[PDB]
Scaffold this motif. Structure first.
Motif, mmCIF file in Angstrom:
data_model
loop_
_atom_site.group_PDB
_atom_site.id
_atom_site.type_symbol
_atom_site.label_atom_id
_atom_site.label_comp_id
_atom_site.label_asym_id
_atom_site.label_seq_id
_atom_site.Cartn_x
_atom_site.Cartn_y
_atom_site.Cartn_z
ATOM 1 N N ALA A 81 -3.506 7.738 7.191
ATOM 2 C CA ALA A 81 -3.802 7.370 5.815
ATOM 3 C C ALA A 81 -5.293 7.548 5.550
ATOM 4 C CB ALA A 81 -3.404 5.913 5.567
ATOM 5 N N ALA A 82 -5.622 7.694 4.271
ATOM 6 C CA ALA A 82 -7.012 7.842 3.848
ATOM 7 C C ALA A 82 -7.209 7.060 2.564
ATOM 8 C CB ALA A 82 -7.329 9.340 3.561
ATOM 9 N N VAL A 113 -0.905 9.513 4.004
ATOM 10 C CA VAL A 113 -0.764 8.683 2.809
ATOM 11 C C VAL A 113 -2.183 8.590 2.247
ATOM 12 C CG1 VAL A 113 -0.353 6.352 1.963
ATOM 13 C CG2 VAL A 113 1.160 7.353 3.712
ATOM 14 N N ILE A 114 -2.381 9.004 1.004
ATOM 15 C CA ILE A 114 -3.726 8.984 0.417
ATOM 16 C C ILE A 114 -3.825 7.990 -0.725
ATOM 17 C CG2 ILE A 114 -5.571 10.331 -0.673
ATOM 18 C CD1 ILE A 114 -4.285 12.848 0.327
ATOM 19 N N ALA A 115 -4.824 7.118 -0.648
ATOM 20 C CA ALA A 115 -5.082 6.156 -1.700
ATOM 21 C C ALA A 115 -6.410 6.521 -2.334
ATOM 22 C CB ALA A 115 -5.159 4.742 -1.153
ATOM 23 N N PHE A 145 -3.345 4.548 -6.307
ATOM 24 C CA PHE A 145 -4.572 4.154 -7.013
ATOM 25 C C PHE A 145 -4.716 2.681 -7.341
ATOM 26 C CE2 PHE A 145 -6.628 3.697 -11.380
ATOM 27 C CZ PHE A 145 -7.957 3.865 -10.942
ATOM 28 N N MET A 146 -5.911 2.162 -7.113
ATOM 29 C CA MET A 146 -6.246 0.808 -7.542
ATOM 30 C C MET A 146 -7.736 0.765 -7.799
ATOM 31 S SD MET A 146 -4.375 -1.947 -5.137
ATOM 32 C CE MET A 146 -2.698 -1.812 -4.649
ATOM 33 N N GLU A 147 -8.147 0.008 -8.814
ATOM 34 C CA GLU A 147 -9.578 -0.214 -9.003
ATOM 35 C C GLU A 147 -9.833 -1.417 -8.101
ATOM 36 O OE1 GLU A 147 -10.882 -0.480 -13.103
ATOM 37 O OE2 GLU A 147 -10.892 1.737 -13.235
ATOM 38 N N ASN A 155 -8.571 -6.673 -5.498
ATOM 39 C CA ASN A 155 -7.698 -5.632 -4.961
ATOM 40 C C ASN A 155 -8.051 -5.043 -3.614
ATOM 41 O OD1 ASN A 155 -5.938 -5.907 -7.108
ATOM 42 N ND2 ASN A 155 -6.825 -4.209 -8.280
ATOM 43 N N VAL A 156 -8.965 -5.666 -2.883
ATOM 44 C CA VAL A 156 -9.328 -5.102 -1.580
ATOM 45 C C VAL A 156 -8.208 -5.295 -0.562
ATOM 46 C CG1 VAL A 156 -10.990 -5.195 0.330
ATOM 47 C CG2 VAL A 156 -11.778 -5.316 -2.020
ATOM 48 N N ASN A 157 -7.766 -6.529 -0.354
ATOM 49 C CA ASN A 157 -6.682 -6.688 0.595
ATOM 50 C C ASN A 157 -5.452 -5.938 0.080
ATOM 51 O OD1 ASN A 157 -8.071 -8.441 2.479
ATOM 52 N ND2 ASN A 157 -7.751 -10.119 1.008
ATOM 53 N N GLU A 158 -5.262 -5.950 -1.238
ATOM 54 C CA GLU A 158 -4.102 -5.300 -1.850
ATOM 55 C C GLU A 158 -3.993 -3.812 -1.593
ATOM 56 O OE1 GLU A 158 -5.909 -7.710 -3.254
ATOM 57 O OE2 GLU A 158 -4.460 -9.200 -3.886
ATOM 58 N N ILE A 159 -5.106 -3.083 -1.675
ATOM 59 C CA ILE A 159 -5.034 -1.651 -1.464
ATOM 60 C C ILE A 159 -4.733 -1.300 -0.011
ATOM 61 C CG2 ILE A 159 -7.511 -1.097 -1.074
ATOM 62 C CD1 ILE A 159 -7.054 1.380 -2.955
ATOM 63 N N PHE A 160 -5.332 -2.031 0.927
ATOM 64 C CA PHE A 160 -5.065 -1.774 2.340
ATOM 65 C C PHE A 160 -3.618 -2.124 2.668
ATOM 66 C CE2 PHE A 160 -9.705 -1.849 2.581
ATOM 67 C CZ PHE A 160 -9.973 -0.909 3.570
#
Ligand SMILES: Nc1nc2c(ncn2[C@@H]2O[C@H](COP(=O)(O)OP(=O)(O)OP(=O)(O)O)[C@@H](O)[C@H]2O)c(=O)[nH]1
Ligand SMILES: [Mg+2]
Length: 168
Positions: A81-82, A113-115, A145-147, A155-160
């Motif tokens: 993932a990236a 998997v790219i975020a 995508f997430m800001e 959204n930091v824990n959320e994106i990971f």
């Protein structure tokens, strides 16, 4: 659950959009207003509980300055993932992120998997990248995508975690 999973994640993006800060926030729950530029890459790990699985993140926080571009494949080659990061207050950083996405789609593992993180969302009073435009770009290119805000933790824990949930 008694299952244990592990995967490699690489962060890429223009300097200094907040890559190291995003990792520090996720791994150590810290945020430093004054953060030294990364040299080459830094490595960190974090283990989280996802449903019935103990997921261990092996994270490569790359230096984003242009002079390190030729080293990027050493960090993304075996990544599952990236997270490509841009700064929502800087359109040029968003354009740079799109070029990082193109490079991953052509040279990284086919199933990576790219975020896409639109970071520094706490500076929305200085926004230069429209949220909907970025969402549309991410949807069209199959990116998560997430800001985010390393500064507030938004959204930091959320994106990971969302990335981990999408891994096999
Ligand atoms: N307001 C705000 N500042 C942030 C945020 N994330 C990072 N910063 C700040 O932005 C600066 C650069 O952050 P870094 O994490 O070093 O950026 P980087 O992408 O790792 O930079 P390179 O290692 O050079 O590629 C620092 O002063 C941080 O405190 C954020 O979400 N909001
Ligand atoms: Mg850094």
């Amino acid at each position: 659950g008694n299952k244990i999973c592990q995967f490699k994640l690489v962060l890429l993006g223009e300097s200094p959009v907040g890559k190291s800060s995003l990792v520090l926030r996720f791994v150590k729950g810290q945020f430093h207003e004054f953060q030294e530029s990364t040299i080459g890459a830094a490595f960190l790990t974090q283990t989280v509980c996802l449903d019935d699985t103990t997921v261990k993140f092996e994270i490569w926080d790359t230096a984003g300055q242009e002079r390190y571009h030729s080293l990027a494949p050493m960090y993304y080659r075996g990544a599952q993932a990236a997270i490509v990061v841009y700064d929502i207050t800087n359109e040029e950083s968003f354009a740079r992120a799109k070029n990082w996405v193109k490079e991953l789609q052509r040279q990284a593992s086919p199933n990576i998997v790219i975020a896409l993180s639109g970071n520094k969302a706490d500076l929305a009073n200085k926004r230069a990248v429209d949220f909907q435009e970025a969402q549309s770009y991410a949807d069209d290119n199959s990116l998560l995508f997430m800001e985010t805000s390393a500064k507030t933790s938004m959204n930091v824990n959320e994106i990971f975690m969302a990335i981990a949930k999408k891994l096999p």
